[PDB]
Design a protein around this nucleic acid. Structure first.
Lengths: 189, 65, 314, 61, 132, 139
RNA sequence: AACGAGACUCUGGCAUGCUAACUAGUUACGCGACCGGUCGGCGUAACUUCUUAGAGGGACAAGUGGCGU
């Protein structure tokens, strides 16, 4: 059927968490050919949840001042990053991306409550939408930091970021920063 | 509606000690189809026509003119 | 014993179905004008799934379509819409041929001649007009016309006494003559504005309806009031039975049928299965049209669907 | 262990700058128990939260 | 926020109190009856009056409103007011009367009334609210 | 015979002309395959892939494109073709297949039949652009 | 009751409905070049989809479901 870039199918992908199942749009009506739709998901609240997760990944990679409109470069970055993971893991890059999104999101956080000066932070829950958004943010932040001044091309540092997260490995920026984030929130219970 | 419903004038008068400024603003009446005032009404003024009183019939009558 | 059961519904519009037209030459074709600027021809399949499906869509107008009619030959269709226009179609290719201009406000009604060579239209201008089939106006009827909108005007099926029947929001019934514009009878006795007038097939009686809900039937011959019938709600449409001498009227969301020989009701037509919407008024019935045979009744609704009723023979 | 609770209604906004939301959540297992919790981010009714520490009940921030 | 103003609300109330017969529930017809009668400037102001008219006519079916007065509604409310049951509420076969009222009627030379029935008064003299 | 229908992104305006043919789709007298940006190739292929090669078999569509940029122009073509095939039906076939194609198109993408109304906001003095302002100096 | 607010003016988005076009085009047909196709090569007639700009429409919390003394 309609498969991403014409070669990566969607019907085989399964979302594990019931919590993020309705906040990840990958399977039936979100099966598109490209991460490019000229969408208007930023007009009302909770509309972005209907944005395909691959297109959501595409946007956050055109970050820092020199790339703010160069979407076609990020479409090929994601296109090449999906054809590399499948060569290493042999699995569906969509499944790898979903498992990375599930793994790298924080489930508890801390919020400033004490008056300015001494920090008296509390412990609060995290919305599923914020958990998805922050997983995407962490995954895209780890991809461009690991590639800033390396011979390694980007879309190879993104692939390595996504592989290490779907395994829940400590060799991953997003997993490392998610573990450090829930650690401090437990301290504030 | 201020660009046609008002008329403005600014003038100087030179007295022995200095200059006095004189400003005159006049807001004109409506005057429909008239030399003075704008023919257009004020944009916020609504004129509702009073209906002509009539007697609704009680019994049916045909008029065979 | 003669009742009517819902045989089905036709869907495909997105606005109030405003008028329905039927022709005797094509039993399998009806026209529906709706408040979405489009006229739809219907092909009636009468299958188990749905009664009929749209076949042609006439996209010519730029406002609500207020009335439509079919010529005796089932190839032409005359329309009148709210942008101010009277449009002639061609049901073979579905493309307009002539445009009929001259009214300054929205044209409310349409009527096409029995001999297929003269047109009458009434508008919000308070002026009735007569037209030729080439796109010109013959008379403008400014001398003592309706002091309010001409709600509906239509011809009579008699060549013996050329008569046109006019309707208006001034609460009066006018009778005219052809070859001139002379008034014959100014029938008085309607309260509230009027919406529809219909002429009996024999050409001797006419029926009109308005906001009072009272539907009076007036003798087109001898010119005297003969019947007054009580419909509870406001009447939006009236119609006469081709052969069973019945009278049909859309009173709000119900349809009352009068024998006119027994002077009493025969059947009430309303679908009230839905009860969840306990805060909204039921959809209203806009228009009516009987089949050529006389056993089918199509009704348009503010619901924007067309409903078909069948006369139970048993 | 980890509990999953379902948001039933949104009460209001709490926090020094209005950054957190009061919710009352109903558990999936032993659904008879509903508790007051604070969240961070956009929340609407029907959202299901993952509670790591499932004994606390919320208070004003 | 989408809140009308006193200009549109006043004009709509006047239109409704003056032309109740022609106005109705449909917006697109009330939009066309306003232009025929009221001398209104442009479409945007015409529509905001003819929309509040349509909104405000539904309330009339629910009952009267404290802002308009139709004489037809006056007639309907007078038909409602001219209501009296066949048997009034003040003609009763038996009227219950306290022993203290009976003595007052005795002083009023009304000791021959036959519809009366003296009842037993309450014994506990407890008709005050506790203090505190 | 033929129908002429346009599609419109920001300032680009494509016009597609459809008549009786054998399966030719060409923009600017050029094959649809080799429109210059190949990255967005599937957006031009979306209508034919969704509907099927057998619907563009008695129709011959030629597109002329002008204005705007590369990405806007590609988006103006996929809408123009989709609208022109919907307009070719309901005029030359019936009011039954137009509904089918219109539904199939509009569930997948509304921008395949409805135009995005967004256009650039004008610059305002006191800032580099519509909303951004110049840096304000304190002391 | 009045000013201010709102209304008002300009602008953007819609109209295969109207009025028009050699200082805008499109379609068709010829002549021509090249291998039925391409031509912003050349000339005629169909008109206004595209371009231009005038008139008039169109959106009002109007419809539905909730909340609100």
């Amino acid at each position: 059927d309609i498969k991403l870039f014409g070669k990566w199918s969607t019907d085989d992908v399964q979302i594990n968490d019931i919590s993020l199942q309705d906040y990840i749009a990958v399977k039936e009506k979100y099966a598109k050919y490209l991460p490019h739709s000229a969408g208007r998901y930023a007009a009302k609240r909770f509309r972005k949840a209907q944005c395909p997760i691959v297109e959501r990944l595409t946007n956050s990679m055109m970050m820092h001042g020199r790339n703010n409109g160069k979407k076609l470069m990020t479409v090929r970055i994601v296109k090449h990053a999906f054809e590399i993971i499948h060569l290493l893991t042999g699995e569906n890059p969509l499944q790898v991306l979903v498992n990375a999104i599930i793994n790298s999101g924080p489930r508890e956080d801390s919020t400033r409550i004490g008056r300015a000066g001494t920090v008296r932070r509390q412990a609060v829950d995290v919305s599923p939408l914020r958990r998805v958004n922050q997983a995407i943010w962490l995954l895209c932040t780890g991809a461009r930091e690991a590639a800033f001044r390396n011979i390694k091309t980007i879309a190879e540092c993104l692939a390595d970021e996504l592989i290490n997260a779907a395994k829940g490995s400590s060799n991953s920026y997003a997993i490392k920063k998610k573990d450090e984030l829930e650690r401090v929130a437990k301290s504030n219970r | 509606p201020v660009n046609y419903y008002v008329d403005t004038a600014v003038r100087h008068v030179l007295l022995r000690q200095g200059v006095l400024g004189i400003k005159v603003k006049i807001m004109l009446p409506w005057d429909p189809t008239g030399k003075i005032g704008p023919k257009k009404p004020l944009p916020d003024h609504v004129s509702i026509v009073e209906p002509k009183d009539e007697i609704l019939p009680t019994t049916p009558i045909s008029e065979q003119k | 014993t003669e009742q009517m059961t819902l045989r089905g519904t036709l869907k495909g519009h997105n606005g109030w179905v405003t008028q329905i037209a039927t022709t005797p030459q094509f039993p399998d074709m009806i026209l529906s004008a709706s408040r979405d600027k489009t006229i739809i021809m219907w092909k009636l399949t009468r299958d188990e799934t749905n009664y009929g499906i749209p076949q042609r869509a006439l996209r010519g107008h730029s406002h609500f379509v207020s009335d439509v009619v079919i010529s005796s030959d089932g190839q032409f269709a005359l329309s009148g819409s709210w942008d101010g226009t009277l449009r002639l179609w061609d049901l073979t290719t579905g493309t307009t041929t002539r445009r009929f201009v001259g009214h300054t406000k929205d044209v409310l009604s349409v009527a096409f001649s029995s001999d297929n060579r003269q047109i009458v239209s009434g508008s919000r201008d308070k002026t009735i007009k007569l037209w030729n089939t080439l796109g010109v106006c013959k008379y403008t009827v400014q001398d003592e016309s309706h002091s309010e909108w001409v709600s509906c005007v239509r011809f009579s099926p008699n060549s013996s006494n050329p008569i046109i029947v006019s309707c208006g929001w001034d609460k009066l019934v006018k009778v005219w003559n052809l070859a001139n514009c002379k008034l014959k009878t100014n029938h008085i006795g309607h309260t509230g504005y009027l919406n529809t007038v219909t002429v009996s097939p024999d050409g001797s009686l006419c029926a009109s309806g308005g906001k009072d809900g009272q539907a009076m039937l007036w003798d087109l011959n001898e010119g005297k009031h003969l019947y007054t019938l009580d419909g509870g709600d406001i009447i939006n449409a009236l119609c006469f039975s081709p052969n069973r001498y019945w009278l049909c009227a859309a009173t709000g969301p119900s349809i009352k049928i009068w024998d006119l020989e027994g002077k009493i009701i025969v059947d009430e037509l309303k679908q009230e299965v839905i009860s969840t919407s306990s805060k909204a008024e039921p959809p209203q019935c806009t228009s009516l049209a009987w089949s050529a045979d006389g056993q089918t009744l199509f009704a348009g609704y503010t619901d924007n669907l067309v409903r078909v009723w069948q006369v139970t023979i048993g | 262990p980890i509990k999953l609770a379902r948001v039933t209604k949104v009460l209001g906004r709490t926090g020094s700058q209005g950054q957190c939301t009061q919710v009352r959540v109903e558990f999936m297992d032993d659904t008879s128990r509903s508790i007051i919790r604070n969240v961070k981010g956009p929340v609407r009714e029907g959202d299901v939260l993952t509670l790591l520490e499932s004994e606390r009940e919320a208070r004003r921030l | 926020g989408r809140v009308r103003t006193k200009t549109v609300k006043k004009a709509a109330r006047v239109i409704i109190e003056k032309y109740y017969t022609r106005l109705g529930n449909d917006f697109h017809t009330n939009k066309r009856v306003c232009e025929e009668i009221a001398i209104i400037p442009s479409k945007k102001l015409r529509n905001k009056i003819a929309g509040y008219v349509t909104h405000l006519m539904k309330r009339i079916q629910r009952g009267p409103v404290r802002g308009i007065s139709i004489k037809l509604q006056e007639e309907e409310r007078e038909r409602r007011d001219n209501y009296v049951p066949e048997v009034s509420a003040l003609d009763q076969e038996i009227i219950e009367v306290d022993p203290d009222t009976k003595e007052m009627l005795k002083l009023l030379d009304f000791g021959s009334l036959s519809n009366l029935q003296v009842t037993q008064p309450t014994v506990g003299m407890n008709f005050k609210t506790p203090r505190g | 015979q033929s129908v002429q229908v346009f599609g419109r992104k920001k300032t680009a305006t494509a016009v597609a002309h459809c008549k009786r043919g054998n399966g030719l789709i060409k923009v600017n007298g050029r094959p649809l395959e080799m429109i210059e940006p190949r990255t967005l190739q599937y957006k031009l292929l979306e209508p034919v892939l969704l509907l099927g090669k057998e619907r563009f078999a008695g129709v011959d569509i030629r597109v002329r494109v002008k204005g705007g940029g590369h990405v806007a122009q590609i988006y103006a073509i996929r809408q123009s073709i989709s609208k022109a095939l919907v307009a070719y039906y309901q005029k030359y076939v019936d009011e039954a297949s137009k509904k089918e194609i219109k539904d199939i198109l509009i569930q997948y993408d509304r921008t395949l039949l409805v135009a995005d109304p967004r256009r650039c906001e004008s610059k305002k003095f006191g800032g580099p652009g519509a909303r951004a302002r110049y840096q304000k100096s304190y002391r």
